[PDB]
Design a protein around this ligand. Sequence first.
Ligand SMILES: CC[C@@H]1C[C@@H]2C(=O)CC[C@@H]2[C@@H](C(=O)N[C@@]2(C(=O)O)C[C@@H]2CC)C1
Ligand SMILES: CC[C@@H]1C[C@@H]2C(=O)CC[C@@H]2[C@@H](C(=O)N[C@@]2(C(=O)O)C[C@@H]2CC)C1
Lengths: 566, 566, 169, 145, 145, 145, 13, 13
Amino acid sequence: SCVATVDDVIEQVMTYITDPKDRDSASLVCRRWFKIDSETREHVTMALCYTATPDRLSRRFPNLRSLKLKGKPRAAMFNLIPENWGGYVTPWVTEISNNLRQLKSVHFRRMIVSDLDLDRLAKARADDLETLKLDKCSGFTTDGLLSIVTHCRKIKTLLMEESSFSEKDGKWLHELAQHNTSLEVLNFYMTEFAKISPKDLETIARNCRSLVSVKVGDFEILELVGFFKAAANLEEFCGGSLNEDIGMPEKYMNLVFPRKLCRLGLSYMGPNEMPILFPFAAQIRKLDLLYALLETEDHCTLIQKCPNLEVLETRNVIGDRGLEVLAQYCKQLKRLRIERGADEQGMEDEEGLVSQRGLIALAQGCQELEYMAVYVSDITNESLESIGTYLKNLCDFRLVLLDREERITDLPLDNGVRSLLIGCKKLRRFAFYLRQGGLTDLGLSYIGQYSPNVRWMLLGYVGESDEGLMEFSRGCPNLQKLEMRGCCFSERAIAAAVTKLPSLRYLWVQGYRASMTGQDLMQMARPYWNIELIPSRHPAHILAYYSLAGQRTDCPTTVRVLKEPI
Amino acid sequence: SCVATVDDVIEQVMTYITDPKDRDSASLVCRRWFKIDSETREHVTMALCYTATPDRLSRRFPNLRSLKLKGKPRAAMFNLIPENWGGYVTPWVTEISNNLRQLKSVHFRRMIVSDLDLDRLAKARADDLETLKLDKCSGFTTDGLLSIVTHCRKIKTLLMEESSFSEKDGKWLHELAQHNTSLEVLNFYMTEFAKISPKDLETIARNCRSLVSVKVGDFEILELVGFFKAAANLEEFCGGSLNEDIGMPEKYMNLVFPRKLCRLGLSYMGPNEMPILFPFAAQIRKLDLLYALLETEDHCTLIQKCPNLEVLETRNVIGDRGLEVLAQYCKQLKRLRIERGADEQGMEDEEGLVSQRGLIALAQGCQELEYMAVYVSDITNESLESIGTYLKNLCDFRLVLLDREERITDLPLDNGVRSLLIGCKKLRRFAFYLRQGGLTDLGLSYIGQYSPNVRWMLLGYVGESDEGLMEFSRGCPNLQKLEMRGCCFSERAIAAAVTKLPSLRYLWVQGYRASMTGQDLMQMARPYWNIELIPSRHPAHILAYYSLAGQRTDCPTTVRVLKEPI
Amino acid sequence: AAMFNLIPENWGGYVTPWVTEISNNLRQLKSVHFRRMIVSDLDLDRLAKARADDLETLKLDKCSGFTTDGLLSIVTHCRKIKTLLMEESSFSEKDGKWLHELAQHNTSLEVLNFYMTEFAKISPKDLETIARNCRSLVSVKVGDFEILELVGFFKAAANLEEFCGGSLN
Amino acid sequence: KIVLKSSDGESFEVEEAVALESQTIAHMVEDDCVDNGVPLPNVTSKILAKVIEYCKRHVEAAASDDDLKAWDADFMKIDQATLFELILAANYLNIKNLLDLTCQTVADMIKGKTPEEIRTTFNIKNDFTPEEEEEVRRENQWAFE
Amino acid sequence: KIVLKSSDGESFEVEEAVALESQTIAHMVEDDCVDNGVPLPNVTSKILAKVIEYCKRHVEAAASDDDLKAWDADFMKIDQATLFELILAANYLNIKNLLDLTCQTVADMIKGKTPEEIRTTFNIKNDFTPEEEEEVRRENQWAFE
Amino acid sequence: KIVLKSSDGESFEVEEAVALESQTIAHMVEDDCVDNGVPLPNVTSKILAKVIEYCKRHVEAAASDDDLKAWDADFMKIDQATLFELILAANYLNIKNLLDLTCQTVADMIKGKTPEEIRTTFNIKNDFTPEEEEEVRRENQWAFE
Amino acid sequence: RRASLHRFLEKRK
Amino acid sequence: RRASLHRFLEKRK
Ligand SMILES: CC[C@@H]1C[C@@H]2C(=O)CC[C@@H]2[C@@H](C(=O)N[C@@]2(C(=O)O)C[C@@H]2CC)C1
Ligand SMILES: CC[C@@H]1C[C@@H]2C(=O)CC[C@@H]2[C@@H](C(=O)N[C@@]2(C(=O)O)C[C@@H]2CC)C1
């Protein structure tokens, strides 16, 4: 018995440090802590798969329980990235086969996943795979799904949201129905399945006592009546199809929703079916009216009945009027997303525009907001000011102003952004997407000056000249990922701003003063810094990121890797 | 909210119905209850594997957690059934691999299990196999044991009692010693192992904190001294070898028995080592003197020290004298089995006969007896009468009278059986095995008349003519399984009694007025009724049972399946 | 001496350590002949899977300890067997699918030999079909098949040079 | 003291440790909706009352069994439609106690009865085709259990 | 009442439900070594004392939270060497509240600090070659997490 | 007079110069732990007894050999398991006289026996491959010694 | 123009 | 002649 050191106790304590940023520090205090962190780290996320080789991952963290890889740039969610760009999951699944023998959960996000690679995953991980998320992935088919649901007999959570695959049959769902007992969450929310049987879904509910969340495609809600009675513990349900026919005026009206349902969104829901929610609206904490067929008036009438609403997603049909409603009935609101609606033939109705009026109303009412993302039809410096004054502890704010309107009240938004960034000092993610007049070099510098906690930024049509990018670049102490499109800045200015930015590890840019020369981007050539061009086949894109691995082996022909003198 | 029905609640309630007979009913109330029972049934026993296909089993009960299959007829435990008769476990383990994905416990009883089929079980079920019972099985080797103990790392209970296999090595035990932590019960009670190390058993004790019961082969008890110290929680121990040498007069005497040991049987224990039990005899609730080397005098002296004895198994050496001892010291006795001893050169001693004297003493002393099975050297109607009067709530009673004695006091036992069956109305299992004069057609009809609760009966040398069988056959409202050997009855009489018996689903008969014709048994040909003959290669056997599957594919040459006109 | 019932059945001769060695280290083996050895189903399932299409010839010669499950395992995994022998072996016969499996997929069989064996569940039709598919079938030895049931077999076995067994009743 | 709002606008004043018998109301003091009282619109007010009565009494096992199986048995002298609503309610909240006793009480009604007696004393229509009934009966008596 | 014998011959009179907070001392009333008092010679007597004090107080959540986080926080106003000995001790016995409390208390010292501040406030010498430090730093910031 | 605390809580009253035969107990009166008696929890109490008996007698070579080899020889008339525990104990304490006697006693069991007789009378499994046994036998008889 | 709503804004009309 | 005691009645003698 001698004086007990930290060393006599750190193996034990390390497992109580949970925060990824504290593990980060701990791993750096000395060789031993490095090793203990290495052998005990349970979850790792890779924001860009091409950032390290799978060998490096499994050498550092041999005992991962949980992995999450992202591939294609966010831009891909907006049809800006070529389908074959990259994000092949397959080297990662072979590494999982051989060296991550502890993995119980895999989340692939925006990646290419083939049937071969999921047959390999299934066989390698088998009964140990508790969760699989194919999140906005492509490249597979129902054979792949069948393979994982027959070899992974204990899957607790299986997700395919927004993935594109080829549907040859429905036996994957049937196979779940027949043998799976452990399913907790099942999610194929934004997906075309035409060959799966609502009977199978119902039988899954009957067999899966812990089934808590299910999201689904265009199933006729009436066909899910059995499902709903059997899903006793259901808390979340999204999807289905509400198809009214004039024939049955009360087609629905007799839905048994599970008594616990509190997170939901029924697709195509109109004003005539809306009322089936009233009986328990007090209970609803999350609403997804993103695919709903209801008008600005109808929004107010439903929002009004949901005092405990903390998350709302919807189209801009919500209108200023809707925001006003939300403003005083739902004081607990934490997250609000206003997507953009049918923007061709009038804004869906003559109230389906949100503006300064709604924003400033919202700012005053829902002061608990942590996430706000809004496609707005018109802004004023005043509204940004009130955001900044009232709703502190906003963590993620995104504003895009639509191109529909001709006249925008007052445009140069410098003084508004500035007070916004000053008041919401908890802000970590920030998107600001405008029109040319929108922000001046002075304002661009403001964004760089007053955003000390911002890790990610998407900047829209900001600035007037290179002066702005450069002024901006002397700020952003913590900016890791920068996405800019529709900006004037020149090659040398982009290059020079990348050099100044202390924390930048990812850059995506569309629209910029190019030059066939190419050779101006080069003035940011650093070691470990990969620059990729997607040529003007949409305007040229620049993708650049740090990587310990060197240049990807697997570029398409549409993508040119920039290297020193040609 | 409408009137809540049973239907809104039955999924939940069903899982509180535990009794197999109540599940049986529940499954029959309507299609829905059938389905819920189907998906929730946890345990299923099959008294005869050939009664349904494995496909049927796993379609009806896809989520079994626990399975128990029996194969060979009980007669096999008495070398009456050919080794190759059937009971092949292999289609069942392939069905478990594919479709009983939830199985955590398997009990095979009197079946043929190969190394291949246990390698497949091990790999298919791996860490999920909590318990494996190879109960009086044959056909495997130590390779199979090794395979399940290396792939099933969490086994809680592993049993091989009375199984025959080829022993190539001792690594299976060593593999448990090295990696197993979870073992609760380990049983190789009646088995020849010559290559396993008592060191490995000791180390298992040291590593398995929940080790409660272990039964063993011919290990020198002295070599287990370390084991006993380490097995702190041990409640049961049977087996070992007590080998005295005149050299060490106090060879033993210094045994540390775990302080909790209360269910035990030391093999070959003589009168000189017996005393090591005295220190805690008050604590002993289960005694297995079946393989003990002690005389009728010594039985009394030990029995006498065990006031709390509720289970005693022993050979007939116990004597009438021992039964008398047991009669007033052990009032709590619930189960007694008196096996037959060395019956060649005098009954082991001149008191080693049990008779009317012991039985009637017993009936009066141990009125709590639920199970009594006895090989008796002489009976009297009076003793049967006292059993019937004093020990109600007897559930299982078996009497066999030895063939040693020439004169049996009073023989026709009709009036005794009759009051026995009338007083013990809780009786579910009944065996009565005599000599020709033993029972008359009148008595035989008594058995059928006064046994409304008997599910199983083994009838010895009963009756005088077909009149008795037929009279018997109009009773036995609940007789499921009938075993008769050494009876005179003719083929047509057997066939006719089967037809009359409402509940019969299993029939085994040895010795009966045959006929090369064969065609008289045919007069019981029903649909789903399988009849099999084991020809007189011992006298011809008749096996017949109901089956949803059709005739077995896997008969040996020694077994002839009877079908309509040859 | 074991061929004259003088040696205990359990004496030894377990083939299993040898098949595990074959799995791992005799990666070139195309022919195995076991004589008077104990062969289990496990050990022939391992042999079949380890050697698969490379196993040209298997001889279970006066061996014991296996069953038709073993046979099936080798005839489904060893799709190119040229010579398969079980003469005088003792095993448990649960079914006839091994022979049927050969009939359905095997083309390469040159010699097939279950001369001194009790098979009651195999079909002479299957044997005939083997003869029809195996152009190089040169030798077959068989159990107590009624010779009359093999008439088709004999017409189809054009290249047959050797035949033993059958039953003339 | 916590407020529970029934499924027909009916506030209920209830003690701390009483409302906590429900793990559904307990996991709801994290994201505390309690600001406006816990909104549970799936329990009838009549029923919620009965639920609180049960929880009230069991929490008074502070002063520490024999008299409980008594109150429990007496609490269950209700009608079917109400028994069922209690089960649905115990499952909606998360009262495991209100469950091992009610469910066992319903199971005790099944135990021992034949299939006819069962649907008699629950009013359930035997919808088996005669083949189905037969197969199930055969499986049950020749094969399984 | 149970006796705990510390690692320097020091008997400790402690109540039933107090010594049971340790599943190591609980799983030791099965094979009851209690005949001679529970021999636990890995805990200093000074430490064992502090362990019993903690268990004593928490068991007095019979009278049923706010004042506990207060006593707990005040109980942890100790020095490092002692904090660490408590962790070791909570692990040796099996006191989830306490191991989960001492370990958490040490972890709270790390949380938020930088790698320098960490080895500062624990006096640990940075033994990384500069290449190693760089690799680890790059991995952490460009690739993983 | 010094106190020795055996490995099962068993105090032993022993004289000064007797406990000093052990240089392990002697180097422990410097940093004198004697305050609480010398804690030696690696010696069974049965064994420690036998050790003290040995030391007691040898210290009585104050009154000044022939009768010692006699008591010694008679002291060693014990069983193997106990001989070995004495060796381990003499090594744990530091009694050079006692190790030279227990070790020699075990060595006397080996002396004169053949390799088979040795593993017989110690129950040791011959784990040599036959080639190894042959090489060693050849080396021993043709080459070395 | 998000890719999930571009699919809906057309399944709508 | 039970198969468990037939093994013993001979291991006895
Ligand atoms: C190449 C970048 C894309 C540019 C895309 C473009 O055309 C406009 C926005 C869209 C973009 C976007 O992410 N929009 C938001 C959103 O969460 O979807 C932030 C905006 C919501 C409030 C990104
Ligand atoms: C098919 C009958 C066999 C015939 C066997 C024979 O020879 C007589 C009994 C034995 C039979 C038997 O079951 N004996 C008992 C016992 O449980 O073992 C019941 C008898 C114990 C008192 C089995």
